[PDB]
Design an enzyme around this catalytic site. Sequence first.
Site, PDB file in Angstrom:
ATOM      1  N   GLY A   1      -2.467  -0.271   5.998  1.00  0.00           N
ATOM      2  CA  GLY A   1      -2.429  -1.237   7.077  1.00  0.00           C
ATOM      3  C   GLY A   1      -3.615  -2.175   7.046  1.00  0.00           C
ATOM      4  O   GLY A   1      -4.100  -2.531   5.967  1.00  0.00           O
TER       5      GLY A   1
ATOM      6  N   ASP B   1      -2.723   3.702  -4.144  1.00  0.00           N
ATOM      7  CA  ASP B   1      -2.750   2.579  -5.066  1.00  0.00           C
ATOM      8  C   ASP B   1      -4.063   1.819  -4.889  1.00  0.00           C
ATOM      9  O   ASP B   1      -4.881   2.136  -4.023  1.00  0.00           O
ATOM     10  CB  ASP B   1      -1.535   1.678  -4.851  1.00  0.00           C
TER      11      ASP B   1
ATOM     12  N   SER C   1       1.826  -2.931  -3.830  1.00  0.00           N
ATOM     13  CA  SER C   1       1.125  -1.801  -4.419  1.00  0.00           C
ATOM     14  C   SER C   1       1.059  -1.962  -5.930  1.00  0.00           C
ATOM     15  O   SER C   1       1.931  -2.584  -6.539  1.00  0.00           O
ATOM     16  CB  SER C   1       1.817  -0.474  -4.076  1.00  0.00           C
TER      17      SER C   1
ATOM     18  N   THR D   1       0.826  -1.201   0.000  1.00  0.00           N
ATOM     19  CA  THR D   1       0.000   0.000   0.000  1.00  0.00           C
ATOM     20  C   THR D   1       0.864   1.255   0.000  1.00  0.00           C
ATOM     21  O   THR D   1       1.835   1.351   0.748  1.00  0.00           O
ATOM     22  CB  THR D   1      -0.945   0.034   1.214  1.00  0.00           C
TER      23      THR D   1
ATOM     24  N   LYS E   1      -8.907   3.002  -1.383  1.00  0.00           N
ATOM     25  CA  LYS E   1      -8.219   3.365  -0.153  1.00  0.00           C
ATOM     26  C   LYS E   1      -8.336   4.843   0.190  1.00  0.00           C
ATOM     27  O   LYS E   1      -7.892   5.249   1.267  1.00  0.00           O
ATOM     28  CB  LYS E   1      -6.743   2.963  -0.239  1.00  0.00           C
TER      29      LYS E   1
ATOM     30  N   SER F   1       3.510   0.617   2.950  1.00  0.00           N
ATOM     31  CA  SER F   1       4.712  -0.180   2.733  1.00  0.00           C
ATOM     32  C   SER F   1       5.596   0.415   1.645  1.00  0.00           C
ATOM     33  O   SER F   1       6.824   0.308   1.719  1.00  0.00           O
ATOM     34  CB  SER F   1       4.331  -1.618   2.387  1.00  0.00           C
TER      35      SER F   1
ATOM     36  N   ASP G   1       7.321  -1.716  -4.928  1.00  0.00           N
ATOM     37  CA  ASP G   1       6.725  -2.415  -3.799  1.00  0.00           C
ATOM     38  C   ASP G   1       5.813  -3.502  -4.356  1.00  0.00           C
ATOM     39  O   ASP G   1       4.912  -3.203  -5.158  1.00  0.00           O
ATOM     40  CB  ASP G   1       5.936  -1.446  -2.903  1.00  0.00           C
TER      41      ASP G   1
ATOM     42  N   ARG H   1      -4.179  -1.906  -5.135  1.00  0.00           N
ATOM     43  CA  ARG H   1      -3.971  -3.333  -4.937  1.00  0.00           C
ATOM     44  C   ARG H   1      -4.158  -3.702  -3.471  1.00  0.00           C
ATOM     45  O   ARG H   1      -3.561  -3.086  -2.584  1.00  0.00           O
ATOM     46  CB  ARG H   1      -2.577  -3.744  -5.408  1.00  0.00           C
TER      47      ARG H   1
END
Lengths: 238, 235, 230, 204, 245, 219, 229, 272
Positions: free
Chosen positions: F47, F17, F169, F1, F33, F129, F166, F19
């Site tokens: 999270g 993002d 994401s 994320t 999100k 992340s 990442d 995902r």
Amino acid sequence: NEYDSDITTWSPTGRLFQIEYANEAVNNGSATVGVKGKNFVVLAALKRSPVAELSSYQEKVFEIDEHVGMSISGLVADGRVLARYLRTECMNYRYMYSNGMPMNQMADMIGEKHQRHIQCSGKRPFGVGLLLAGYDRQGPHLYQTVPSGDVYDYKATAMGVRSQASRTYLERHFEHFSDCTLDELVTHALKALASATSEGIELNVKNTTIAIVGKDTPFTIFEEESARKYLDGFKMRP
Amino acid sequence: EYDRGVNTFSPEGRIFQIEYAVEAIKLGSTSLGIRTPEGVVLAAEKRVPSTLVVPSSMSKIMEVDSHIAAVMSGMVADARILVEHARVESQNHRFTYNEPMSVESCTLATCDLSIQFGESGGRRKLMSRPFGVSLLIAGVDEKGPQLWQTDPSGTHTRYDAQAIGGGAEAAQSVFTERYHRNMTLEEGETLAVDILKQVMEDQLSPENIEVAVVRADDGKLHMYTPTEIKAIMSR
Amino acid sequence: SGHDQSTDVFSAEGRVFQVEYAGKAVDNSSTAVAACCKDGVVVAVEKVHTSRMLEKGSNNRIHAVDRQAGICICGLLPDGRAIVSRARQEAENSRDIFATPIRGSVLANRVGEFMHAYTTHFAYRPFGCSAIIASYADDGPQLFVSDPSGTVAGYYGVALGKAKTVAKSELEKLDFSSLTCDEAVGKLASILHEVHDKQKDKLYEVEVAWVCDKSDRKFVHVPADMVPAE
Amino acid sequence: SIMAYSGGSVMAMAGKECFVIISDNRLGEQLKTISTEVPKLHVVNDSIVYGLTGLRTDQQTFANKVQFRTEMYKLREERDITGKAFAAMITSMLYEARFGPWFVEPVIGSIDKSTGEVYLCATDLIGAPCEPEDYVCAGTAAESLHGMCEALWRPGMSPEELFEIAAQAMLSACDRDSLSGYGAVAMIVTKDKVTTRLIKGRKD
Amino acid sequence: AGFDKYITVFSPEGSLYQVEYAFKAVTYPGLLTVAIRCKDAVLVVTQHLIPDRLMRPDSVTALYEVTPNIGCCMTGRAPDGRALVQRAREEASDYQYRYGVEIPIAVLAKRMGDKAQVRTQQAGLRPMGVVSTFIGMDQSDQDGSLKPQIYTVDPAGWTGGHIACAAGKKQVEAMAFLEKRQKSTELDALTQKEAAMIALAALQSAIGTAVKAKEVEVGRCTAANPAFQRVPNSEVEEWLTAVAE
Amino acid sequence: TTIVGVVYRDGVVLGADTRATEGSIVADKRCRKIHYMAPNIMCCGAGTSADTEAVTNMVSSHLALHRLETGKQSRVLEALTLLKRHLYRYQGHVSAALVLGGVDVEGPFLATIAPHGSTDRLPFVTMGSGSIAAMAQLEAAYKDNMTCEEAKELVASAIRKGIFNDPYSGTQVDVCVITKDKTELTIGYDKPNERMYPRQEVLLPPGTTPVLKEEIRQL
Amino acid sequence: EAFYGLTTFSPSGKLIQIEYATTAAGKGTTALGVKATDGVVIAAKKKAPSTLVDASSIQKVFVLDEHVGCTYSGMGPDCRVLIDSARKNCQQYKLMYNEPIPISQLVRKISAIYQEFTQSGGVRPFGCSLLVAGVDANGYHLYQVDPSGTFWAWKATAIGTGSPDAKAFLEKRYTVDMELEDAVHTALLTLKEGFDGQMTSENTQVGRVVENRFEILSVDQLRDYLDQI
Amino acid sequence: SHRYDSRTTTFSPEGRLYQVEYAVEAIQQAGTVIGVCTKDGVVLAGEKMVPHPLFDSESMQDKNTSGEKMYKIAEHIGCSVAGVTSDAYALLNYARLSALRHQYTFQEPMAIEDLCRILCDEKQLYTQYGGVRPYGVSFLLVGWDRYYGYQLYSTEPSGDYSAWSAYAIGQNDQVAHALLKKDWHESMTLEDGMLLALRVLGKTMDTAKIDLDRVEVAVMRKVPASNIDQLLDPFKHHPKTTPRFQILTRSELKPHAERADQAREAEEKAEA
């Protein structure tokens, strides 16, 4: 009277009639006398005499701590509750400080306990009066508590039925109590107690309890066997 | 009537509910108690409502412990609570100290339960009224035979010969005479039977009253059977 | 009728009669006077004794609440003791939570709020005493009076009790700007002695306390040999 | 783990005006098959069908709670609960026990009887929702189910084609899973009718 | 069914007698307050009379600080209002700790009215026989500017804003004077001096004694200085001399 | 994320993002999100998705009730205080890292709320992340008083940095622009990962799967 | 501490306390509501005690949620408790089901508090009546709720002083296929009939439920409707 | 204060609780509802208040859960109320909660007698404890369970309940009881039973040509099962017929009303 049925009701003249009724209850109990000397305090309690064969016993004088005791007058159950509270507080104090509770602090605590029951709707005043006899670093102490919560520091006093005679007798010999010895103090207390008895009853061991507290004397109660030394030779000489 | 509260004082200083509960005692059956150096005797008038009632189901004398008995007068339904509390406290004392509980301590526990009445809820649920029961607790302990009397006010009093119930004043008048410090157990039993005779509206029969004895030498409670009551009468 | 049986009831004219009855009970109590002398506060009360066998100091009506604060009780003494306990709780809360002595005005406001809470609920009755708060805090000398109604007022000089009007009139003759505690003690004792009736209260004692610079700003009782004999 | 103790897998797939929800039949204790005839599907009403996967006792307790809630909802609100409201209610119920979580993982499919829009949901054990437009799946064979659905699903499927895709995906996912299998049970929900079918599987 | 006026129960006429009696406790002390708002400030003037010359005049006051930006005036039973002030302060503090911003004056008035309504529905509680007048500045949207605000809370729990208001003994005469003055001028377009003169004139005309400066206390919030503070006696004196023309 | 927030000339630009990973496997490729908080306040979350959704929904409901009570528009500081008190009350066990962005009468307000309850008000922020790779982009191209287009492009680039570096994401960039008057939320602002090599679409004729029993229920 | 009930039955089977509360609920200013095939309009009467009351600060029309509004007649402080409870119930419903609360469920929830205060101990019934207007999945709704807790579904009703005359006027004027602005005209005329003076946009508060929302009318909008009747 | 306490849960010098009697008197003024328990269903017929021309119908989907007088407790339980309607709603919610709790615990429909008992203890509790007024409402419970089939219960605002073959509550309940005793037999069909209901209602409310706008009718009967799905739980027995509570509509009630009033003329024309 429509202002005497509740404790949280003020009379239009500024009176609380329930507390006055509790004082009246105290005024109808057995007569008791407290006398304070220079080192000793002596309580004299007038217990019920037997009806010619039938001796009834009721505990009026209580031992609160090694240095403290008291005499009750009025509602015996209220006196028992107050004795339990005082004993618990004394045990708590002696545990924390390894010494007996001072008498002034004790009197303040009894006053606060009495006041706690005269302002809540779901409470009633203690229908009992107390005479507290104790000793501490400050010397002998003699207190009297009333249902209203007032605590009086007394040189000598009396309470109960026909105790006005005891008080008016004590008002003639009290200023010398600082010089009378223990035996003289006991005789003065006995004379005051005898001044409150009826016409045809004379003080004797069967119907009198003698409590003594002093500087080297823990609060000691004196009854049938141990009271021979103070009451066997005793008579009121007018 | 709810004009006055339950904690109110009379202008003479007496609590109205406690004085009203005392008058309920005088409406109950008569109960006796005699203390003698040989032991303590409890006597009670059964006053069964009918001849069809099993007389043992209305026991006016209940056993608190093997050395302590209790006879009640007044409202027998409320007396069961007091006797159960006394039994529980006596068993607790035996559990904690490995010794029989004294008669005075048992009476103290009974009065401690009795005094807990009022109306303010707050933290603890109190009784809405005092007990309409006067208890007469008899027993034998380290101080010999002891007899105590319990009031609805929560006041315990040690007695030599006390009577409660309807025929109380006549029983006391008989007590003033015909009684001394050192009667034998049989003399006390006969005195109790005669006093029951003097204050009973019904006729005295072995199944009409209840008699119990706690003996000083034995130290145990002994409920008397109708044949024993007849033997007492036949003397 | 039933409009004066509890504090939670207003009268038809917007009055709380139980509080007035408590104030009437206060007005039948022994006289007390107090003076703020621009360098300290002096309070003096009269104690009437119903017995000649009372030990000296019995039924104290002046009690120290903090080091610099004290309260005199005019009225029902046990109620005053409860109020004093509440004030002592308030004073030690300030010294424990805020690490500062409680200001005189703050203590007076707390006492008034405590006394007022008993005039609003049906389950309680108002206190039958007036509280005289004498403080010497960081806000200077302060003298306050708390009414059974819970209202607090600051004064230069104040009188309460049965012989209130005459004592107030005697207090009106002082200056309170040039007045000092040393002479204020004598002035208050003389006023109490003069205003008291000698044929109804046979046993009377004058109890005087003060907190000024001479006591290191500590609320204490007077030295015994300082008040006039009569 | 606790979620794989009882086995079981459920998958919902979206058609045009329809959805197919399919569950396996196996119930076991971590290796041992207690029964081979335990479907995990539940019908809420004519529009919503949901399945539970996880600890079997938690499945049954949560299903009882959901039945209680839906019956109370239909009594209070004189109407059938909708798919989105039902999914939100499950999310709230699962999040109430956020630190004492239930060990279920629901898979909800619903369709509007008047509109025909298809709504799919698949929350975690604490209620974290997930609403895609193609398919959802939960259980021990979740990875294989995801792979098969990703490889076989297309947007504009007919109820029959969607059922065939779902059956093939379910069987192929259960073949690679030791905690799932023993045939399948499928429910095809359209705007007009609801069909229930039982699909042959390996007895392994 | 006989009393119906000692506890918070409805009368046969659908009225609460214990709440109407608390309205008479507001005017019982004989005190009067007038609150007004000008184009950029809000003022409140309260009678501060000390017949007892032995009473410290600066100890007793009817003006209280609820928050630095919200001030209050209590008219009625003096201790009762004090209690409400405490509640108001708590209702501020908790709010400050819950949302991180200072409580709006209207929200505080609404919550204080909610507190008053509870005592009119619960049997054992006595209503506070005072009328609360909160003055302050309100932060406006889409321009960021501050506007003066007056909000009154009744013993019945009624909460209301005011351009100008009066409360206490002879409040009807003060309100009539303010309404008569409003028919000619526009209060929301006046300055602080004119508003203060109008408020003092209304207070004087209600009682007809030509008050001095020591007999009143004035609280103030301004747009330039949003904090609530009491006007010094010199400015009150000059206002009174300006009125005396 | 990866969630990013940027303060520009007039307003705040948030980005995220799409995902969502079900424990190292992609559950949904278009998760949302950027959550709603107020007409002028938005909050991106990272999270535990359940915790973020629950806390955002609760605080948004509380804000709606509060605006009904007061009649004013909600302040970003109020939402920040509510979120931080709730997150601190649970000692970080409600694992939700939030990026709160809004516009008030006091101007744009952008802040981060840590799962433990700490808050930081900054001109540009990253969480998740993939935050670090996002932050390195912001530190490389951020300037004061950017226009709306510059802020949107910077946010999209910073999100793409977390998308590609990442594993947790990717798959889209969600962009939300918040001003004094209008709040716009663009979902498909950037789609760097398109659909390549389409499916074979192997057909399975109806009847290839044997059926043991069948039951049809008409409605 | 006041745990006994204040509302009790009478020898005639009447709860006279609830009847007195209903009498109190009919002494407020006139409020009314009108339903129509495409929305509901509720109008109240904000008659301030003086011209120094800042009529913008006094409100008689309230928004309970983004789809439902309310108006009352009687004790305002009593009404505010119910308004807050209804708003909290709407928020809780949206939190639980992620849907706007249906008007019937909200009316049931409001009615339960009325019964609670008419039966629980130590409290008196509310002295206000509510007019709730809203949209839900099954159309437009307008309910009246009384202090006893009883609720009705209305097509056009009125509460407060002069409510019998307002209802009589509404009965003859209401039409089964009445449309939105026609209902607003009817409501304004009904208020004007019993109005003591002249209706200004600062004297009246109106909220028209329009197809997704409550949307209390602005001063300019009310002027645009007031200069047309 | 204790002075103003009305002492609701107290005995009187005759051993009677005045609050309970006053609640019973309150129920006497409520609308009349009559229940008839036949062998193939139970019929409830109640008089609703005169419909004002401005009354609106709540456009509820699923028009079988609650009417103006009659409500559904569970799928197999229905009820009718007489008295304080606002008090009736709380008790209806409590009964629904109790039935669903029983279904949660045992996964079986609650017995009609058990549900009647559980909500009667709720009413009794308020007459002995709490110090508040009791519920002023009477319930007519209908339902079906496998232990006793179709059942009919009546509850008093004191906790007492009784089982009846035919009963009535509300206005003119004594007259309704007298008329139901004249005409009732065990060999009575459902349509006959409904004919008995209306014919008794229209005579208690004293109307000829019974008005359809003032009467509501509900039926507890058994219908063939509809949503039986054996494949989803192969080990569960699904009964062929399930109990159904159905509230009659305007078009459904008038065919039976026409039978009642022509029966009325057929029985009154021959009295000469």
